[PDB]
Amino acid sequence: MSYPEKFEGIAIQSHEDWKNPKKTKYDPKPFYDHDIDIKIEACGVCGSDIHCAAGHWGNMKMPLVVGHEIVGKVVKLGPKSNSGLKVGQRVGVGAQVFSCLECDRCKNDNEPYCTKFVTTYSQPYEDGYVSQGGYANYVRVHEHFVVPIPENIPSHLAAPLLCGGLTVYSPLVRNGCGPGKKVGIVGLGGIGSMGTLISKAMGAETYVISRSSRKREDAMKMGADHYIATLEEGDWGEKYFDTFDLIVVCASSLTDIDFNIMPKAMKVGGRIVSISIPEQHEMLSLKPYGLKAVSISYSALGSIKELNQLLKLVSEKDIKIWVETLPVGEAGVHEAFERMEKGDVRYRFTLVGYDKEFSD
Amino acid sequence: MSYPEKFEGIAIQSHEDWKNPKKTKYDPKPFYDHDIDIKIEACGVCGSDIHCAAGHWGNMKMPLVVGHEIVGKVVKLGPKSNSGLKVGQRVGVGAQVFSCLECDRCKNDNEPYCTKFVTTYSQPYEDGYVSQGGYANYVRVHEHFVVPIPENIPSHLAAPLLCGGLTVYSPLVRNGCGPGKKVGIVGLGGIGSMGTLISKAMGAETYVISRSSRKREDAMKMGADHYIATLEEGDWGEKYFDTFDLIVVCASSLTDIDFNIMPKAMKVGGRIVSISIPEQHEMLSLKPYGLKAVSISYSALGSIKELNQLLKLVSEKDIKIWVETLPVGEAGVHEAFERMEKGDVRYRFTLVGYDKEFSD
Numbered sequence: 047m048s049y050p051e052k053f054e055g056i057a058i059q060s061h062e063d064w065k066n067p068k069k070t071k072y073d074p075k076p077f078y079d080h081d082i083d084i085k086i087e088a089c090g091v092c093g094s095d096i097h098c099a100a101g102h103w104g105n106m107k108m109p110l111v112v113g114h115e116i117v118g119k120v121v122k123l124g125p126k127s128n129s130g131l132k133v134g135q136r137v138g139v140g141a142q143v144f145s146c147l148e149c150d151r152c153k154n155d156n157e158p159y160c161t162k163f164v165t166t167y168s169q170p171y172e173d174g175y176v177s178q179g180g181y182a183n184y185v186r187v188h189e190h191f192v193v194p195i196p197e198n199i200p201s202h203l204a205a206p207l208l209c210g211g212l213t214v215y216s217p218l219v220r221n222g223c224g225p226g227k228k229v230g231i232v233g234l235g236g237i238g239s240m241g242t243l244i245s246k247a248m249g250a251e252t253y254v255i256s257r258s259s260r261k262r263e264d265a266m267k268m269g270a271d272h273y274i275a276t277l278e279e280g281d282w283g284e285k286y287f288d289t290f291d292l293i294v295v296c297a298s299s300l301t302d303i304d305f306n307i308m309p310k311a312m313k314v315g316g317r318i319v320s321i322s323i324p325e326q327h328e329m330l331s332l333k334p335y336g337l338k339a340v341s342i343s344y345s346a347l348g349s350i351k352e353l354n355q356l357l358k359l360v361s362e363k364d365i366k367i368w369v370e371t372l373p374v375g376e377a378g379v380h381e382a383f384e385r386m387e388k389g390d391v392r393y394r395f396t397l398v399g400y401d402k403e404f405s406d
Numbered sequence: 407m408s409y410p411e412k413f414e415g416i417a418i419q420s421h422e423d424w425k426n427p428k429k430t431k432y433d434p435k436p437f438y439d440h441d442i443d444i445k446i447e448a449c450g451v452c453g454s455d456i457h458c459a460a461g462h463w464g465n466m467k468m469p470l471v472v473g474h475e476i477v478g479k480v481v482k483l484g485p486k487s488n489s490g491l492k493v494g495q496r497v498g499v500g501a502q503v504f505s506c507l508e509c510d511r512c513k514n515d516n517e518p519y520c521t522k523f524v525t526t527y528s529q530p531y532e533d534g535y536v537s538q539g540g541y542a543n544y545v546r547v548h549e550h551f552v553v554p555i556p557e558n559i560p561s562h563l564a565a566p567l568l569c570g571g572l573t574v575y576s577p578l579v580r581n582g583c584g585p586g587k588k589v590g591i592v593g594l595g596g597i598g599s600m601g602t603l604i605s606k607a608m609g610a611e612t613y614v615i616s617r618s619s620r621k622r623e624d625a626m627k628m629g630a631d632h633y634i635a636t637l638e639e640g641d642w643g644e645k646y647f648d649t650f651d652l653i654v655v656c657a658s659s660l661t662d663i664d665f666n667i668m669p670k671a672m673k674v675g676g677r678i679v680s681i682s683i684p685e686q687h688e689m690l691s692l693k694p695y696g697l698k699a700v701s702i703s704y705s706a707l708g709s710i711k712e713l714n715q716l717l718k719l720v721s722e723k724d725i726k727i728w729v730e731t732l733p734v735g736e737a738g739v740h741e742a743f744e745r746m747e748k749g750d751v752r753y754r755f756t757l758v759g760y761d762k763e764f765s766d
């Protein structure tokens with residue numbers, strides 16, 4: 047029906063026909079004291095959107111609305127709301143959508159690591175409702191996880207930051223990325239590029255680390271201080287020995303990644319932080335003998351604090367990421383999904399034209 | 407013959423008979439401009455002394471004088487010596503004995519991680535001579551790697567800190583071991599014991615992590631603010647979820663770290679540092695999302711700068727490690743290698759009584 051009782055969206059109907067989501071109406075989650083309703087206007091197509099829909103993460107209950115780099119207008123506020131969020135405001139919602147908000151980790155700005163963590167879609171809340179929203183007309187989210195979008199960031203350029211961006215930003219900040227450091231980006235995909243830009247915006251000397259040579263010209267155009275092509279090096283660890291302070295791995299998979307070499311290019315005390323979550327059938331493998339004075343670790347999304355910090359940065363040092371736009375709808379999400387599989391993205395897809403697709 | 411012509415120690419003869427080191431004389435390494443000669447007066451038994459003799463590091467060119475926790479007085483100073491070391495001065499030498507002292511890692515106090523790194527024993531120098539010293543009347547080391555043992559530290563207690571000690575000290579100071587911070591030591595062995603102490607010494611709430619409760623009492627005696635039993639407490643990472651900032655492991659190895667549990671006990675940002683040395687080819691496989699907000703790596707000895715700090719620390723806060731001495735001689739050694747390869751050590755042996763064993 048309409049916005050209050052039913053939500054509509056382009057939802058995955060089966061993990062086999064994942065490339066052909068169908069428009070669907072579905073019950074919103076129950077509305078809670080702090081939840082907020084957002085009418086979407088733009089959403090970013092994230093690699094996770096794919097892994098999930100393709101069933102790479104396990105059998106997900108269907109139907110399923112994906113997409114978690116949401117930008118839209120506040121349309122209704124929860125009873126016990128409190129955060130200046132005002133109906134009509136252009137806000138954003140990323141990958142996380144809930145946290146206990148009371149444990150130390152939460153109060154210490156580490157809600158991505160909260161015990162009661164809940165992702166935007168494909169997860170059941172305590173009430174049992176499995177998070178939806180994203181490629182839809184409305185999303186229902188607890189206010190703590192809704193951020194304001196700096197007035198000067200085009201929606202189609204703000205959206206991706208909400209997850210792909212925040213995902214590189216959190217590890218970068220936390221691990222010293224900034225003036226005078228030598229940062230490295232593995233995998234120039236959707237996150238990688240944002241991670242390259244954001245890298246520079248923070249002040250470091252960034253190295254893009256890809257396997258083929260295709261993305262070279264593009265990397266420099268983003269401000270890369272240098273480019274490396276694994277397949278063309280034979281042992282870049284050996285060659286770039288003792289150069290990197292921090293390296294963030296943003297690959298969609300870890301199969302074409304040598305964690306037995308990477309350490310060499312790491313300065314004493316350097317740190318390797320992987321950001322990826324590959325198919326359920328993959329491990330992070332390496333001969334430990336190399337983690338000599340080098341630390342390897344995995345990182346989740348970022349804190350909402352960091353998320354606002356990023357939004358501030360992109361807004362201030364005026365960051366313009368690489369996005370292509372497609373209209374929400376079965377045909378658009380199809381092309382989006384299709385191309386993401388083909389890796390045929392000039393980095394980021396942002397579904398738009400939400401109002402001329404969902405009507406009432 | 408004697409000191410100038412050639413030394414003599416309790417050398418090993420074969421990786422097989424490694425438990426029966428026969429006394430042997432050998433030509434000292436060349437005496438370069440900046441080297442120094444030390445008539446050892448005390449030495450500590452390091453686990454690695456065993457590991458090397460047993461051949462866990464591969465087949466070594468025989469014979470071989472192990473031991474690299476050397477304590478002794480200065481005999482001669484190379485023609486260009488400029489450390490400020492006086493002859494007869496009480497100094498010490500540990501696991502490292504050389505570094506290019508010209509590379510960045512060096513001018514930045516990271517000698518252990520230097521390219522031209524050379525260990526105290528069983529390794530050829532730039533010139534080919536295989537490093538000796540240790541369980542002998544003397545040892546010829548580059549002055550740079552000679553530290554002035556503090557006047558108030560009984561030489562049978564100073565020695566262990568040269569290696570063992572320093573090995574845990576570094577990981578601790580480099581990872582912020584101190585007031586507030588909650589340190590966790592895994593493996594109440596030799597290195598593990600000096601760790602618990604130094605940890606408390608440095609002002610950090612310390613937990614000792616062993617599987618059994620055997621050493622449970624000793625731990626509390628050394629200052630441990632708490633004790634944990636691996637096998638005994640089942641899922642300790644759960645019980646102690648989100649507590650440790652740092653954990654320096656000293657057990658069997660890094661690939662024995664049940665990451666399906668240990669990480670759990672690490673607070674977001676936590677560091678698991680192994681101090682054991684992995685096989686150049688051991689390969690580790692943890693979930694891509696296993697080290698969630700937890701890093702993992704290993705450390706090697708420490709810089710002399712740190713080595714001195716440790717000494718200064720031990721001197722001032724006056725710490726006494728749990729040492730048991732033995733006669734520096736074929737007989738003694740056997741008792742040591744024999745009780746080391748068993749754990750029948752009250753943490754650290756110190757082969758003393760040099761003067762009354764080598765004569766001339």
Ligand SMILES: NC(=O)c1ccc[n+]([C@@H]2O[C@H](COP(=O)([O-])OP(=O)(O)OC[C@H]3O[C@@H](n4cnc5c(N)ncnc54)[C@H](OP(=O)(O)O)[C@@H]3O)[C@@H](O)[C@H]2O)c1
Nearest residue numbers: 093233234235236237256297298299302322323345346347
């Ligand atoms: N922890 C978190 O909070 C979080 C949040 C969001 C996403 N993620 C993870 O981030 C990934 C999403 O990727 P994305 O959306 O940023 O980018 P994407 O547009 O999917 O591109 C991924 C890029 O990584 C590289 N890649 C793909 N397959 C690879 C393989 N087999 N071996 C080595 N490199 C490969 C490619 O770059 P090159 O060809 O240039 O090497 C590719 O362009 C997923 O794995 C997801 O689980 C984690």
Ligand SMILES: NC(=O)c1ccc[n+]([C@@H]2O[C@H](COP(=O)([O-])OP(=O)(O)OC[C@H]3O[C@@H](n4cnc5c(N)ncnc54)[C@H](OP(=O)(O)O)[C@@H]3O)[C@@H](O)[C@H]2O)c1
Nearest residue numbers: 453573593594595596597616656657658682683705706707
């Ligand atoms: N990187 C460096 O600079 C450096 C310098 C010196 C030494 N090291 C390394 O440090 C180790 C030397 O040990 P150490 O001399 O300090 O002590 P040690 O007296 O040899 O005792 C080692 C202790 O670790 C634990 N352990 C032994 N086998 C184990 C196993 N299979 N699984 C789990 N835990 C086990 C035991 O403690 P619990 O029974 O209480 O658990 C044992 O008492 C070697 O592995 C060496 O390579 C590295």
Ligand SMILES: [Zn+2]
Nearest residue numbers: 146149152160
């Ligand atoms: Zn929480």
Ligand SMILES: [Zn+2]
Nearest residue numbers: 092094209210
């Ligand atoms: Zn994402």
Ligand SMILES: [Zn+2]
Nearest residue numbers: 452454501569
């Ligand atoms: Zn040692």
Ligand SMILES: [Zn+2]
Nearest residue numbers: 506509512520
């Ligand atoms: Zn050097």
